[PDB]
Amino acid sequence: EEHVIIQAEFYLNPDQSGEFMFDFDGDEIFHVDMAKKETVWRLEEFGRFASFEAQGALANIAVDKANLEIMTKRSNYTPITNVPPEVTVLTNSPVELREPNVLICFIDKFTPPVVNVTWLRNGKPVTTGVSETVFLPREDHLFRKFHYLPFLPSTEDVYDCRVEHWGLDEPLLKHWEFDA
Template sequence: MRPEDRMFQTRAVILSTLSLAFLLSLRGAGAIKADHVSTYAMFVQTHRPTGEYMFEFDEDEMFYVDLDKKETVWHLEEFGRALSFEAQGGLANIAILNNNLNITIQRSNYTQAANDPPEVTVFPKEPVELGQPNTLICHIDKFFPPVLNVTWLCNGQPVTEGVAESLFLPRTDYSFHKFHYLTFVPSAEDYYDCRVEHWGLDQPLLKHWEAQEPIQ
């Protein structure tokens, strides 16, 4: 087996259970139009986070299994009242994946998959009005493996309050994307950066944002 084939096989097995229940790639091909898409996705790896088990519907997060607390965590409380999912089912699948990962690592002579660097964009959730609360969104896209360090900066200083983040969300090409959020009040004096660190980057990537003065 060629090295590049082993590398692809390693990546495919690590993420082998991206169960995309939208009739595969036909959704965007014109052959079949899917009204709704449900996605189960799980992965394991040898670095933190060591794994993830999640479910989304029409690209909205529904729940994930907290692998440390061994419980189902619903994105919204009403989802948990209307639906149910036993965390043990997800944990059992994660255990199988871990076993398969160990076997694959040994058979691939510990060949590591390539590090794909992320693409990063920053944008406000709502149209910006100075002095009105808003949310900045940092979208980190097309990266592999699912290992990131993300920091919000305001005027060059780290911000830890008012921040939130999504899970690692799967893409059909076995890469990932992720959202980080910062609640803030726009002003003409402040500027913001989303700093992203990833193994595919030679140095941290800073994506800049600041409020623009309205055109008179």
């Protein structure tokens, strides 16, 4: 296969959370913000090349939830088995003192799609300019997710990506420090 486009959607109970997104060769083209009924492109420029009626995703989620209600009953209410995530923290590119870079926390191979993620600097939470992606699909049907934190490299700053998952016995933390 030269290319693959995947329309992925899901609904979860009792959290009552659902997502709808299109993936192209592992990357996200866009997702729909349920609450706002708006199409959110992964890259700004995409909204000038195409369009999608967000209203359709809401209709789809309605069906997925209805199917979950029925399949939860027919499966005798057997709960999903928690699968703990694998976390990786790396920079967008080689680090250089006083040169703007970006820290990336890559959470992969886990389910259900629910996680608490916090960027810690020297042990204290940081939210300045932090961004994230929705839950992305995998061929093994688990989930992937990215978290970003733009920072200014320094030998005085230590970072950690703290991740919490119901399949994890304790908060998982990944450390990162400038290599001097």
